[PDB]
Amino acid sequence: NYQRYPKPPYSYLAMIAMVIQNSPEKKLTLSEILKEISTLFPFFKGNYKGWRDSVRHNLSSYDCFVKVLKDPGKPQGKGNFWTVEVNRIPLELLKRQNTAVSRQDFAQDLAPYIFQ
DNA sequence: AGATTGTTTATTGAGA
DNA sequence: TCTCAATAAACAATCT
Secondary structure (H helix, E strand, C coil), X not given: CCCCCCCCCCCHXXXXXXXXXXXXXXXXCHHHHHHHHHHHXXXXXXXXXXXXXXXXXXXXXXXXXXXXXXXXXXXXXXXXXEEECHHHCCHHHHECCCCHHHHHCCCCECHXXXXX
């Protein structure tokens, strides 16, 4: 039960960091991240919704994404803010990937959207 | 009751 | 032929 989708040629890591870093407070809920990613990359407004799980997975699986409690009172509370420590980002992951999509035809490097 | 969030385990497949 | 980003899903706990 597996298949690759014609997503934009940027890593989920890069797209997440970009939307976070461009938010007014440099922090966003998961919900806001998903919304903002689909706004910048229309593909994600479509039928396929598994990208939402993928995004959730990246947040927990890279050290550059640090969770911040929405309520100090509840350490196990939901709807927390996510932030990015940009210096903890492996720079190759911000480059445009060569995949089916980018072989057909934002910029080649997302660093100038992130190091802001 | 069903959806969402955060964490984790696991597999896949294509690019270097 | 080896790697790891992409993708799928289990599980617990909160949330609507």
